[PDB]
Amino acid sequence: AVSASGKWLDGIRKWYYNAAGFNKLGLMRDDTIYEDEDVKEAIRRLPENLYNDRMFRIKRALDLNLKHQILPKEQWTKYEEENFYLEPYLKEVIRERKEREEWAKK
Amino acid sequence: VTRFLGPRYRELVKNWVPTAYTWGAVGAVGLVWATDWRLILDWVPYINGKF
Amino acid sequence: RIAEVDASVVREICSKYIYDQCPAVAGYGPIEQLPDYNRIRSGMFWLRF
Amino acid sequence: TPMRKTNPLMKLINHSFIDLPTPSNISAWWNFGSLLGACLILQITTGLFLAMHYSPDASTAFSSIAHITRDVNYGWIIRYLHANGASMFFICLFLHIGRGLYYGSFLYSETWNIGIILLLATMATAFMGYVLPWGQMSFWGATVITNLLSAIPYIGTDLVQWIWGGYSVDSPTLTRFFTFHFILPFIIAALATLHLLFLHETGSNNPLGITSHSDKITFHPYYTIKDALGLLLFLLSLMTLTLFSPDLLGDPDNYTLANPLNTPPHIKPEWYFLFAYTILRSVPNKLGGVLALLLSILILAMIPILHMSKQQSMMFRPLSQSLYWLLAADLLILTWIGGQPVSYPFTIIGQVASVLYFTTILILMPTISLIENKMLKW
Amino acid sequence: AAATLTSKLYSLLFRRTSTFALTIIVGVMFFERAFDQGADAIYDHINEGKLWKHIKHKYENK
Numbered sequence: 193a194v195s196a197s198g199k200w201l202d203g204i205r206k207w208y209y210n211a212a213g214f215n216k217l218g219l220m221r222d223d224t225i226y227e228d229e230d231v232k233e234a235i236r237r238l239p240e241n242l243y244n245d246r247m248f249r250i251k252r253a254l255d256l257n258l259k260h261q262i263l264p265k266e267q268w269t270k271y272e273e274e275n276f277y278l279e280p281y282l283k284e285v286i287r288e289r290k291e292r293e294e295w296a297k298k
Numbered sequence: 299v300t301r302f303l304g305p306r307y308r309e310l311v312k313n314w315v316p317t318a319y320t321w322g323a324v325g326a327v328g329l330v331w332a333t334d335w336r337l338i339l340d341w342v343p344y345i346n347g348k349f
Numbered sequence: 350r351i352a353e354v355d356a357s358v359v360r361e362i363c364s365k366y367i368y369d370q371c372p373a374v375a376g377y378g379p380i381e382q383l384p385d386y387n388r389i390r391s392g393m394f395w396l397r398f
Numbered sequence: 399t400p401m402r403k404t405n406p407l408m409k410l411i412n413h414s415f416i417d418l419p420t421p422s423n424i425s426a427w428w429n430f431g432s433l434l435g436a437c438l439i440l441q442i443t444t445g446l447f448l449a450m451h452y453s454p455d456a457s458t459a460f461s462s463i464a465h466i467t468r469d470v471n472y473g474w475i476i477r478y479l480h481a482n483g484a485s486m487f488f489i490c491l492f493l494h495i496g497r498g499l500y501y502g503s504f505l506y507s508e509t510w511n512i513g514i515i516l517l518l519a520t521m522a523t524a525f526m527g528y529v530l531p532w533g534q535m536s537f538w539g540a541t542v543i544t545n546l547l548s549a550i551p552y553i554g555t556d557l558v559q560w561i562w563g564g565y566s567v568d569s570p571t572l573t574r575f576f577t578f579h580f581i582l583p584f585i586i587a588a589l590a591t592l593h594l595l596f597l598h599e600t601g602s603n604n605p606l607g608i609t610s611h612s613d614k615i616t617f618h619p620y621y622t623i624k625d626a627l628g629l630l631l632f633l634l635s636l637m638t639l640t641l642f643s644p645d646l647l648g649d650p651d652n653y654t655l656a657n658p659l660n661t662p663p664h665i666k667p668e669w670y671f672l673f674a675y676t677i678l679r680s681v682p683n684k685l686g687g688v689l690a691l692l693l694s695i696l697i698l699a700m701i702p703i704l705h706m707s708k709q710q711s712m713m714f715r716p717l718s719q720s721l722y723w724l725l726a727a728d729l730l731i732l733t734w735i736g737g738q739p740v741s742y743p744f745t746i747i748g749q750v751a752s753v754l755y756f757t758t759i760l761i762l763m764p765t766i767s768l769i770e771n772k773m774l775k776w
Numbered sequence: 777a778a779a780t781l782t783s784k785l786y787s788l789l790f791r792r793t794s795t796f797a798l799t800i801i802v803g804v805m806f807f808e809r810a811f812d813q814g815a816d817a818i819y820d821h822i823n824e825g826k827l828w829k830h831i832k833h834k835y836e837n838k
């Protein structure tokens with residue numbers, strides 16, 4: 193609930209965001225998430241163009257990892273640049289699982 | 299067995315004989331070298347590791 | 350000219366322009382089972398021969 | 399219609415080796431796994447030619463090895479390749495487990511558990527095999543390790559004498575250890591087959607941690623020569639350890655005959671066990687030291703349960719990476735402490751190092767994982 | 777225009793894999809002996825007078 197200290201939180205989140213290396217590979221935040229079955233169904237529900245963008249950026253990341261190189265500095269993902277595309281879908285899936293479970297315990 | 303006889307089979311075997319000379323030379327020279335046979339190796343111009 | 354052609358000639362020339370070469374390859378999808386270029390280049394020559 | 403697809407043996411080889419997809423971006427660390435697969439063969443083949451002269455009687459076990467190192471032609475190279483070979487085996491093993499702990503490979507829980515059981519098998523194998531030479535450290539190590547079994551509260555000594563085959567360590571114990579040492583590695587091989595069996599229906603993990611289905615590639619063209627180079631470097635480092643400095647990973651005193659009567663000073667077990675041994679040195683209680691010992695290796699099974707991060711690899715999560723290298727440094731600390739006599743400086747550092755070793759991976763890691771979760775806004 | 781020595785080495789030999797294996801084994805046939813006497817000459821060179829085979833003269837053949 194902090195104010196300016198919350199801006200400080202934005203600062204440390206930005207620094208930690210640059211501490212994570214996926215920006216070096218062009219990845220969006222959501223590409224990095226571990227793909228358990230909930231995430232699997234979450235990816236299944238993605239719109240085709242977005243799913244294509246995801247698969248291609250994943251290939252670009254793996255390909256850069258092949259030759260142990262790095263994406264050029266101009267092309268790095270920026271902290272404000274990201275679109276958190278997978279969140280609504282994954283939240284729908286997880287909420288559905290929690291609903292099925294809460295029904296299942298009764 | 300009987301079917302394998304035939305002029306094209308003769309042409310084919312004639313096509314593949316030199317390869318058999320090559321692999322036969324490979325196995326022969328390789329066998330001699332591996333066991334360091336004294337009788338065959340000495341005849342050679344330079345290989346005289348055996349005394 | 351065609352009458353002059355012989356099986357030995359076909360073997361010499363096909364061995365000359367095809368055997369152990371480095372082929373151009375093109376593939377319009379859905380390719381994925383298509384062998385990686387090393388598998389193809391390896392597939393351009395026998396070891397038995 | 400390739401013949402690989404037809405004949406069943408060629409089918410299985412077509413699966414396990416020639417054709418199975420792997421992530422393209424696999425690095426040098428995964429190679430260690432295959433190296434372990436290689437090491438076992440060596441440890442068999444080489445060892446197979448030591449069993450042809452070794453006599454497992456207590457009265458002649460030492461002189462027979464003198465017979466191997468001296469009288470037998472080219473016996474000493476087999477001896478040293480074998481002994482150093484076990485050390486390389488555990489080095490590749492530790493690096494392998496560290497690789498599996500670092501990149502979040504433990505999520506393949508069944509493969510993980512088979513790896514743990516296979517680990518315990520290799521440990522028992524190395525122990526009984528180290529008991530075989532029948533030197534000072536060998537005999538004494540056996541007495542010290544065996545007594546731990548005596549720790550168990552009710553069954554204890556009856557069970558311990560059941561291992562000894564007598565009141566005290568002697569020839570029958572040596573013969574038994576020769577048999578189990580002979581038999582265990584092949585069981586380790588069958589487990590390894592199970593290990594690869596569970597492994598391949600999901601596929602090998604990649605360093606990024608993202609699924610690599612988009613960039614799968616056949617194993618034969620690339621990783622066979624990559625593993626050829628890794629195996630070549632392995633043989634390089636092994637032959638350099640054997641032909642130049644055979645002894646330094648070993649311990650003098652083994653070249654002395656075992657004395658049931660006399661007792662050696664430093665009494666240090668061979669280095670790969672040392673850290674575990676420190677834990678025995680750390681807890682004053684007997685049974686408590688035993689349970690802490692069993693927890694030292696079992697603890698690996700609890701790791702998947704303790705996982706909290708929504709990602710696999712540490713590489714995108716630097717804080718946990720720092721905890722990881724703290725853990726490695728701590729293992730170096732214990733490993734060094736195992737080589738030292740009890741004294742004020744060592745006992746305090748050993749206890750702190752052990753407690754830190756348990757607390758860093760039962761507490762700190764999940765919590766900083768949660769912190770890394772909150773920092774990334776999900 | 778003129779063929780490179782690697783090419784003359786190639787078409788005469790490498791194009792057919794059996795000839796390739798053959799030249800490999802012959803190459804091993806010479807390389808074994810060459811590497812042998814070479815490395816032995818080196819190891820002899822490092823420590824003249826230490827090795828007994830040259831120490832034999834002080835006491836050999838009556």
Ligand SMILES: CCCCCCCCCCCCCCCCC[C@@H](O)O[C@H](CO[C@H](O)CCCCCCCCCCCCCCC)COP(=O)(O)OCC[N+](C)(C)C
Pocket residue numbers: 310311314315317318321322325397
């Ligand atoms: C004392 C030692 C004697 C032996 C000498 C050394 C032997 C070396 C090892 C021999 C290996 C043989 C190499 C030949 C490899 C070719 C295999 C295969 O590809 O050949 C097939 C068939 O090959 C022939 O059957 C055999 C040819 C070679 C036989 C030579 C034998 C000569 C022996 C003579 C006796 C001398 C020694 C006797 C000692 C007792 C044809 O291939 P294919 O791609 O399908 O044909 C086209 C497709 N078709 C069938 C549909 C048309």
Ligand SMILES: CCCCCCCCCCCCCCCCC[C@@H](O)O[C@H](CO[C@H](O)CCCCCCCCCCCCCCC)COP(=O)(O)OCC[N+](C)(C)C
Pocket residue numbers: 328369394396436439440626627629630790791792793794796797798800801
């Ligand atoms: C400890 C446990 C593991 C064992 C230790 C293993 C140590 C090995 C590590 C070293 C790495 C070796 C790999 C190096 C490459 C191998 C050579 C191979 O690539 O040769 C290929 C093909 O191989 C050879 O051509 C055939 C064999 C030739 C030599 C045969 C020698 C005898 C070997 C027989 C052994 C059989 C096993 C049973 C014992 C007798 C060439 O293919 P390519 O370069 O792409 O294209 C060439 C095109 N040509 C042929 C038309 C010119």
Ligand code: HEM
Pocket residue numbers: 437438441442443445446447448449452463466477480481483484485487520523524527528530531579580583584586
């Ligand atoms: C993963 C498998 C194996 C490992 C890690 C291993 C390790 C060891 C170790 C550490 C020693 C102690 C030697 C010393 O310190 O001097 C040893 C000795 C011995 N090993 Fe193995 N071993 C393995 C498998 C085998 C196999 C399959 C055999 C089959 C014969 C075998 C036969 C022997 C024998 C007979 C000795 C004692 C002889 C001597 O030391 O001179 N081992 N082994």
Ligand code: HEM
Pocket residue numbers: 427428429430431432433434435436438491494495498503504506509510513514516517590593594597601602603604698
């Ligand atoms: C002699 C001992 C062992 C052998 C021969 C062996 C064999 C293998 C092989 C061949 C692979 C293929 C992938 C690779 O090589 O990286 C593999 C992977 C794997 N191993 Fe082992 N292993 C051994 C010990 C262990 C141990 C002790 C553990 C865990 C404590 C373990 C856990 C794993 C895991 C989790 C993978 C999956 C790799 C991935 O997900 O990418 N293994 N093993």
